[PDB]
Amino acid sequence: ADQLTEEQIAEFKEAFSLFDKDGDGTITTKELGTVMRSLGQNPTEAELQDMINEVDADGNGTIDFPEFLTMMARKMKDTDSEEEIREAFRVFDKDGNGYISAAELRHVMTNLGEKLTDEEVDEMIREADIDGDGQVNYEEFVQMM
């Protein structure tokens, strides 16, 4: 129910590496800012510290994998403001048409430094797609969060 499996853990660990650019096992504010800006955002140094802070359970300044996994376990359960998820959707939906295509996901992942085959891309779409049109619309993006 509320339980992440062995493979769900491995997928989160993989995701964690997107943010941990140097693979030292911690996300710094600097690494967060570079991810944020690669997604069209522009947080300030203080905003980046606030972000880290909501997640930084041990107060050491960085996010390790356990802290990341904790935040993700929790975010899987909770519901966000319509406009928090709307802003997230807009990063993927580059042409504003209301549908995240495989190409748009490929663009976002590439800009994030990620090496994706289009069987890996189609499969990501496959998981989020509810109606079967081969794209991700807003409703399906919501349900996914």
């Binding site: 991810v35 928090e84 990063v91 996901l105 976002v108």
Partner: peptide, 14 residues
């Protein structure tokens, strides 16, 4: 994959 969910998850921290 948990890329999209974590990207959105991180967005939400802001």
């Amino acid at each position: 994959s948990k890329y999209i969910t974590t990207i959105a998850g991180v967005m939400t921290l802001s």
